[PDB]
Write a protein that binds this DNA or RNA. Structure first.
Ligand code: ZN
Lengths: 64, 121, 145, 182
RNA sequence: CUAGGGCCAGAGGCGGCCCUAACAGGGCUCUCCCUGAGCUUCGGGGAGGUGAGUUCCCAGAGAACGGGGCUCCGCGCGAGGUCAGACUGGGCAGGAGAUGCCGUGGACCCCGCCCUUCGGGGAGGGGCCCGGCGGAUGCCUCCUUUGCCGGAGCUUGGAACAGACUCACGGCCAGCGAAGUGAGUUCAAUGGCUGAGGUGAGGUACCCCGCAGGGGACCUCAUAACCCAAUUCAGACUACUCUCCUCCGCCCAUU
C-alpha cells in the first residue's frame, strides 16, 4: 500500500512483474517484453493456439 | 631472533634520521613526522617489544619524538593531589599526564631498573 | 582521527623547498655510514643474494637514487636523494632548489653504494613500503625496459 | 625458557664531569655575589613592615622552560632531586641553543639554604638580558665545563648508532613479582 | 495448486529515505576506520542498531566481577590535651605551584528558555576535570593524630565510556512425461572472402567559392583483445582497450 501510494499496482500487476518485464510509460508501468524468449512462440500461439492480454488502461465515460 | 635484530637497525635508523632532521632544520618537520609515522607503522604491523620511555616520548597522537622538547610544551603543575607533568604538542592538541614524585621512586625503578639489573647473557 | 589528522598536512610545502640543499648533505653521510655498519664486509667478494636480502628488507628512506631507464624519457637522467615514499610514487630532492615526484610505475633506479652499483626495478616495489620489510614478496612477473 | 629480545635505546646522555673543586669555589663565589647585593626582593614580595626585583629569577620547572623556549641568553642551575631527574631535566639538556645549563649534583640545595627565601629550589634560572647584575658571574659563565650532547647531531657532521638488544627474561620478573593466575 | 499464505513460540526485526520483487540489487544523505603524487568542501574500500562469548608472553591494581599494592579527601565511629583568637592569636600546606584570566572539550551534577509530554533533542549560567599564559600566600575558628569504610587517581602494554572477531533476531510447508528460444547445438553448427563509406591519421600536380583560406574529391595504413551461449531474465564480480564524457597528477618546453 505504501508503494501503491506512488504507482498504480494493479491486481495482476504483481503476477506480471513476477515473470515479465515491467517498464514505466506515459501512464502506469506495464509489460513491454516477456522474460523468456517467445517471439516466435507468441506468433505460434496467436495463429492456432490460445493467448491473452491485460487491458486495464481503457478509461470509461458513462453518459446518462 | 636474527631477522628481528635486522629490523632493529632499520627502526633505530629511522629514529636517528628523525633526530637528524629535527636537529638540521627548525619548524619544518615533515621528514621527521613521516619517518616517525613509518617507525610507528612498522611497530604496529610487525609488533615488537619496544622501550617504554622513548616510545612515550614519541607522542603517539600523530608523530612527534623530539618536537615537544624544544618546540612544544612540557611543564609541571599540581592538579588534584600528586604533582603531574603535562606534555602537550602543538599539532593535534592532545595531552599527556606523567606523575613525578619522590615517594614513589621504587615504582620509578620497578619497570626500568630491573632490566638493567637482571640483564644476563 | 585520520580526517582530524589531515587538517594541516604531513606533506611538504613551498617553504621547505628553499632549505639550501647542502644542509641535506649529512643525510647521505648518515645513510652511507648505516650501510657501512649494516653490511660490514667488503674486500674479497661475498654472496650477492645477501645483498638482495639487504636491499629488500631495509627501508630505502633517505637514499641516493638515479633514474636509469623509464617509460618517460624526461624522467630519465634525474639523480638525487629521496625524501618521501607513497603507494606508487616517491618524492626526491635534486640540485639547486627544486624537487621532483618520481612514480614507481615502470622504471628502474641506479643506487650508488660505497663501492657497488645496484639496479632496482621499481615496479613491484609499492603499496606502503613498510609492507616490503613485513611480508609477502613472491616471484611474479618480469619487466622489459 | 621464555626469553624475548627488546629494542631498548637509551643512548646514555651522561652529565658534566664531576669537577668538585672548581664547582665548589664558583658556587661559593655565586653565594658571595648573591649576598653582596641585598634582600630587597623578599622585602618587596613578602612585604615585611624594587630594583632587585627586576631580575627574572625563573623558579620551578615551568618558569625555566618558558624562559628557555623562545629566544633568551641566560643561565640555568639544575640539581638532581630524586633518581627520576633525567625526564625533567631532559628539557634542560635539549634546550641548549643560546643558554648555559649548569648542573650540580650535590650542592644546589646548599646554595638555597643560606639565602633568605623559601623551600629548597630544585631547578633555577635567571633572565638578566641587558641589565648589569654581576659582571664576574658573566665571566664565570664561559668558564664552567660545557655539556656536549651526541643524541641529536652534536653540531658536528658525524653520526654514531649503537645496538642495545636487551634479552627480557620471563623468569626474572616472575621471581621478582611472584604472581600466578589460573 | 494467487507463498500480497498458514502453523507452535516470539513481541525482536541489521543507520535513515526512495524504486524494484531481480531485497547477497541500485541511488542519495550522516558518522566511524584505513589508504591515496589533485590542501582536503577531494577520491576509493569496509562498517552502522541490540544481546552473549573471546582476545601470544612480559608488565600493570584491574584485558568479565571482587579482594590483596600505594597516594589524596571525610555531614561516620574513637583517643588525648581542654591551655577554647593573646601584638589578626594558633595549626597545616605552599617556587617540587596556593591563585588569577580564557573556553564551538566531558557519556557528570543543578538551575533554566524553545519543539514536545516514553527513551527526550538544542542556545546559556554555577561546581569538578582539561588545555594555554603569568606567578605568593590559601584553609579553619578549641585543636591534633593513626585505624576501618566510602570516593577518586596512576608511567605499563599494539589494548582500559574502547577497539576487533564470532554467533543470534526464526524454522517448516507448494509441481507440471507430449512438440519445437526475434541463434538453440548437444560424439557438441553459427563472428568465412571481396569493395566502398564510419572513425583515428598522413600526402596532394583534382574541383567549387575569393579573408590569408574554407568545403568536397583521390591513395595507403589501424579497426584489436577478453572470450566463447545449451532455458531466460534482473542485479553484483572478475578479464579488456580500436572507442567516447569528465576529475586529475608528475616531468619537459614557451610567454
Ligand atoms: Zn602528537
Amino acid at each position: 500500500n505504501r508503494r501503491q501510494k506512488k504507482n498504480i499496482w494493479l491486481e495482476t500487476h504483481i503476477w506480471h512483474a513476477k515473470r515479465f518485464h515491467m517498464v514505466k510509460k506515459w501512464g502506469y508501468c506495464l509489460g513491454e517484453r516477456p522474460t523468456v524468449k517467445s517471439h516466435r512462440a507468441c506468433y505460434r500461439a496467436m495463429t492456432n493456439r490460445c493467448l491473452l492480454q491485460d487491458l486495464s488502461y481503457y478509461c470509461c465515460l458513462e453518459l446518462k | 631472533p636474527v631477522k628481528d635484530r635486522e629490523a632493529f637497525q632499520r627502526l633505530n635508523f629511522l629514529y636517528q634520521a628523525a633526530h637528524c632532521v629535527l636537529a638540521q632544520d627548525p619548524e619544518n618537520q615533515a621528514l621527521a613526522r613521516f619517518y616517525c609515522y613509518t617507525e610507528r607503522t612498522i611497530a604496529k604491523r610487525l609488533v615488537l617489544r619496544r622501550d617504554p620511555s622513548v616510545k612515550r616520548t614519541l607522542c603517539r597522537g600523530c608523530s612527534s619524538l623530539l618536537v615537544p622538547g624544544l618546540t612544544c610544551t612540557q611543564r609541571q603543575r599540581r592538579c588534584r593531589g600528586q604533582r603531574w607533568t603535562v606534555q602537550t604538542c602543538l599539532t593535534c592538541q592532545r595531552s599527556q599526564r606523567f606523575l613525578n614524585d619522590p615517594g614513589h621512586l621504587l615504582w620509578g625503578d620497578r619497570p626500568e631498573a630491573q632490566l638493567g639489573s637482571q640483564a644476563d647473557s | 582521527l585520520s580526517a582530524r589528522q589531515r587538517r594541516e598536512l604531513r606533506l611538504f610545502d613551498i617553504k621547505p623547498e628553499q632549505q639550501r640543499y647542502s644542509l641535506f648533505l649529512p643525510l647521505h653521510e648518515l645513510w652511507k655510514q648505516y650501510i657501512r655498519d649494516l653490511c660490514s664486509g667488503l674486500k674479497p667478494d661475498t654472496q650477492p643474494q645477501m645483498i638482495q636480502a639487504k636491499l629488500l628488507k631495509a627501508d630505502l628512506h633517505g637514499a641516493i637514487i638515479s633514474v636509469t631507464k623509464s617509460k618517460c624519457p624526461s624522467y630519465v637522467g634525474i639523480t638525487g636523494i629521496l625524501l618521501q615514499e607513497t603507494k606508487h610514487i616517491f618524492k626526491i630532492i635534486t640540485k639547486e632548489d627544486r624537487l621532483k615526484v618520481i612514480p614507481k610505475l615502470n622504471c628502474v633506479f641506479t643506487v650508488e653504494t660505497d663501492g657497488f652499483i645496484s639496479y632496482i626495478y621499481g615496479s613491484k616495489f609499492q603499496l606502503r613500503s613498510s609492507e616490503r620489510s613485513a611480508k609477502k614478496f613472491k616471484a611474479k612477473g618480469t619487466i622489459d625496459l | 625458557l621464555v626469553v624475548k629480545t627488546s629494542l631498548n635505546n637509551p643512548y646514555i646522555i651522561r652529565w658534566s664531569a664531576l669537577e668538585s673543586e672548581d664547582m665548589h669555589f664558583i658556587l661559593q663565589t655565586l653565594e658571595d655575589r648573591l649576598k653582596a647585593i641585598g634582600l630587597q626582593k623578599i622585602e618587596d614580595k613578602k612585604k615585611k613592615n624594587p630594583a632587585h626585583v627586576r631580575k627574572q629569577l625563573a623558579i620551578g620547572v615551568n618558569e625555566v622552560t618558558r624562559a628557555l623556549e623562545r629566544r633568551e641568553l641566560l643561565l640555568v642551575l639544575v640539581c638532581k632531586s630524586v633518581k627520576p631527574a633525567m625526564i625533567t631535566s631532559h628539557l634542560i639538556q635539549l634546550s641548549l641553543s643560546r643558554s648555559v645549563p649548569a648542573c650540580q649534583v650535590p650542592r644546589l640545595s646548599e646554595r638555597i639554604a643560606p639565602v633568605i627565601g623559601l623551600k629548597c629550589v630544585l631547578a633555577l634560572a635567571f633572565k638578566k638580558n641587558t641589565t648589569d647584575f654581576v659582571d664576574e658571574v658573566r665571566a664565570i659563565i664561559p668558564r664552567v665545563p660545557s655539556l656536549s650532547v651526541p643524541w641529536l647531531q652534536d653540531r658536528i657532521e658525524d653520526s654514531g648508532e649503537n645496538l642495545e638488544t636487551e634479552p627480557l627474561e620471563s623468569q626474572d620478573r616472575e621471581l621478582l613479582d611472584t604472581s600466578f593466575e589460573d
